[PDB]
A paper describes a structure:
Ctf4 forms a homotrimer that has the potential to connect the CMG helicase to one or two Pol α complexes, via the α-helical bundle at the carboxyl terminus of each Ctf4 protomer, which binds to a short conserved motif in the GINS component of CMG and the Pol1 catalytic subunit of Pol α (Simon et al., 2014). Crystallographic analysis classifies CIP-boxes into two related groups that target different sites on Ctf4. In addition to its role as a bridge between the CMG helicase and Pol α, our data indicate that Ctf4 functions as a key hub within the replisome, linking the helicase to a diverse set of partners.
The first of these was the multi-functional nuclease/helicase Dna2, which plays a role in the processing of Okazaki fragments during lagging strand synthesis, and in DNA-end resection for homologous recombination (Cejka, 2015, Kao and Bambara, 2003). This sequence is located within the minimal fragment of Dna2 that interacted with Ctf4 in the two-hybrid screen, and associates directly with Ctf4 in vitro when fused to glutathione S-transferase (GST), in a manner that is dependent upon residues conserved with the equivalent motifs of Sld5 and Pol1.
Author numbering:
A (entry chain D): 207 to 219
B (entry chain E): 207 to 220
C (entry chain A): 474 to 663, 671 to 791, 814 to 927
D (entry chain C): 474 to 663, 671 to 776
E (entry chain B): 474 to 791, 814 to 927
The structure:
Amino acid sequence: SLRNIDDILDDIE
Amino acid sequence: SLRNIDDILDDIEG
Amino acid sequence: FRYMPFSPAGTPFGFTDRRYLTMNEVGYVSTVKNSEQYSITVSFFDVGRFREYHFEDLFGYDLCFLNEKGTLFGQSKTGQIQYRPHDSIHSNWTKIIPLQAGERITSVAATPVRVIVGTSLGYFRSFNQFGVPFAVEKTSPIVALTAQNYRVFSVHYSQFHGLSYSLSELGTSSKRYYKRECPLPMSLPNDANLDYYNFNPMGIKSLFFSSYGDPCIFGSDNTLLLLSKWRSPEESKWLPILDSNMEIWKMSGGKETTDIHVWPLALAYDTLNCILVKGKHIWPEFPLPLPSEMEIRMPVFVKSKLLEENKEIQIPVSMAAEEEYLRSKVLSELLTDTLENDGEMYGNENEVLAALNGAYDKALLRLFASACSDQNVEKALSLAHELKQDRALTAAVKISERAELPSLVKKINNIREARYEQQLK
Amino acid sequence: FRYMPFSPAGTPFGFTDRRYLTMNEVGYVSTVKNSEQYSITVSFFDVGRFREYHFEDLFGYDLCFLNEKGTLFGQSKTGQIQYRPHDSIHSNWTKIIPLQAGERITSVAATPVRVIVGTSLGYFRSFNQFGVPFAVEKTSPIVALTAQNYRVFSVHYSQFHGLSYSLSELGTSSKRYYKRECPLPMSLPNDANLDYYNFNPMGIKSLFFSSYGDPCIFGSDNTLLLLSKWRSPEESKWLPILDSNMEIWKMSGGKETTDIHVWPLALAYDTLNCILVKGKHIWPEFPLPLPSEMEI
Amino acid sequence: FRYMPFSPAGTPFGFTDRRYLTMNEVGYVSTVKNSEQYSITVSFFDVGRFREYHFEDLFGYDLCFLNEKGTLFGQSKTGQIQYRPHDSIHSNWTKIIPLQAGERITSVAATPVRVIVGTSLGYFRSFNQFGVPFAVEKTSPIVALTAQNYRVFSVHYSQFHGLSYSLSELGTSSKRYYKRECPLPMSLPNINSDMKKDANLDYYNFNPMGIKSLFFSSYGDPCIFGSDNTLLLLSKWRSPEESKWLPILDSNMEIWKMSGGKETTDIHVWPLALAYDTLNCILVKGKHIWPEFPLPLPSEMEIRMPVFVKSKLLEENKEIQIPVSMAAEEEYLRSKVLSELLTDTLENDGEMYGNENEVLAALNGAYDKALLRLFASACSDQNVEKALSLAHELKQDRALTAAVKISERAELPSLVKKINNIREARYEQQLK
């Protein structure tokens, strides 16, 4: 779950 | 004309 | 000691009859031995803007500096300099620098507004782009000069201190120093390349201002050094921002090479414009290859640890996030200092800084995720403190939730609340 | 010149198979050559405060620094460091420092919030107490490092002017230099104690901050030098506030007893916490005598 | 390194039995070996003002400094100083400077209001005209001291930093610095192995640093004169970030021009003081580079910016004649520097002699007048760009008018319009 955080990282924009 | 500019330089005094 | 005529990225003659006088992001200037005279060829990288030309050197110019508006030529022994604007609109002009017993011109530099001449006795002669002298200054013996607009980066050498540097501004009024003869921690040289180190004893392959106005130097140790915080004298630090030996080592898939070398041209934000020299010697040959680009990398990678992760080099994401964090941190701190004091220069600095801070948090959050993986609540909290955007503090809370660390979540939410209450003062 | 791995109040192996890595007012750290690896022991003087422990050193650490919260270990050739907090609550962490050809870690230092690594090429790598890198700085070659809170006192060596010192604060804003490679007024060394001056050619027995923030250094001339008023670069002065060569003669009341040498640990306001060495060797051996103090 | 007792313009004994202790614009102090004692003679250049006197030195004074109100004598080894006021009003007084193991007094200096003693360990001991001690300060080892009124110019030398300088003021309470241990870019001597039989080696053993003299100018700017025979002046010393050492006189070049372009080997300059734009000096003719006995009458050498080339000066001649177009560049530069220096003086200290504002006015006048000749030459060669940049450096608005009239006579109406824009821009900034 923690290895792929692009779902969280791309929400910052 | 440009070689002798003493006529112009002395006008600065006033 | 023998001071040698210096020019950015200049090469020696070696066993040939031609060398490069100087070389940067604008182009390259070569000279060819021609019986008893010389044939100088000024060439450009943007062929659309300027037209390559050449002329006959009846003096033996061994000093050169190239900018976007003109080329400056210097003769170290006779003291004769010449400035040739690229456009034929503006006229060429020639001066003869007075030189005392054994005094040599050691470095010349030119911007669109200033012409700089440094000698081995420490004479610092400045002019405008038309040759009108502003003032003669005596400093420590000068070994290298670069300039940008109205600012000058000078390297000095005594028998006492070694290598020092000065950073000054030649404003409309007078010369002001930002840094005066501070220590220059560039590694001196310690052979097939003996021809080079007789031609450039210090091993200063090139030095230049960055595209954003920060001083940079490239020594024989092939490490790009950038001067940080030069506007605040007590905060100045030289930061190694590129181990080009390592980048070549990583390009070659971990294999040690002996025939690939870097020749520095300029630094544009995060990219080192350079020439990749393949051959026995470390300096470029004829014809000159097309410039390459090498992205700067903080020297934090270990060869031992990089070989294991492969078993072109592949970098583990967790390790590349640490380097990307450091690199974004340094670049962001440098660009903010520029914008806070000098403003913009190219038109994209505000956008670059925005995307830079974004990449900072994103890389920092990856390190945060790795710390939650290892159940390292303490290390994670320290990482979250270094986050910039508040939207990234939220992203850390959501990462902490996915790791089921409710103790961490509350401590990060205290950070968010503390920053919100500074928004109220 | 040979850059030797330095630690505060460290002793050489000599002819024994054990020595002291570092040593100060907190405690002493020893290492022992066993069959194949090494055995590092971390001991304390206030035994009622910290738990003494030992571990097997598979790497051969020759660099150490001890503070009131943890112990920093360093290997000068492989570029490997390790920080072990005294409290079991916090994790041990390990990191490898990049090293070019012939580059050696020459000194390490740590505080509750900072970890410092210096090399023979002038690299200055700082971290927090968990191993997160903060900045990589390029200075003159580093030979000795010490730190306290956010301050750092670094001794450098130039090919030209010799030994110099820098004093800086790694604050939360940015690093700030109070002194930048200024003259270090220390006497270089001038046997049975010949094994030592190969282990430490610069003769710097130890260096530390006083309990009130001033940098201190203890040269081979056995004189405690203190840097006063460094916050004002105009009034900065180095003061020889203690000549232990005379304090032994004055306290003994007898004659010049060459059986007594002083080993400095730290300076705490009014007393010099130190170790009094009895023997031919000027460096302490095993067992370690009780710490004594010296009025200023 | 061996610190040697230094005094402004002092000469060594060499192979004689007499030398000059110190020497400046006021006069000269000589000492003669007298069996086992010494005969010191204080002489003046204005014979009307002061009366030459002499006395017997039973101590061996090797340090001296001369001002307009008294003479200071110092003994580098015993640490004994003595101040002899010229006038009988105040009595002579003597002190013994504390000296440690191997500590030597390296330089003494005195003004009518201050007495300064510097040692080889860097001790800076100051007193007033009567001998009342000021606070004692520890600095870098001092090699040379000069002073003027209440301000002190000190030169320091470590094996670490090299050659530095400090510029301070000795106020009523304590010492305040204008500049502290900034780099002193004076060229050190380059001694060879053939110089071990040279006739002038005696000098560089008596003064290893080669500081022939150092002094404040008549307008209060620090000056130093090294073995390279170049007069260095410190400009902008009131603004630390702007301080620059400016070479304003290549005396080897002036001698080369006095001799009609011919290289000489027997004429040398010995610096006394700097008066505005003229270097008071002694022209030493002989085998040695320092003056001997008797002393010639002082000469005057006008400062000249080192911008003249020997090659280009020989061609224009084919006493050296300077082409008007080439002399205009040097006259522009020199006027620019002098005007910049005098303006700083008046804006911070005011006048000191009573005629400075007139000097600055005529100075700025010569600045524009020299600048206008450079402007005319640029209009001659149709170099509109170079001319415009020259016009921007003009000071008086009436000189901008003279440029407009010169541009009209050159038939460059585009330039005329651009010069009148400068007048408009300056009128606009005078109101905003």
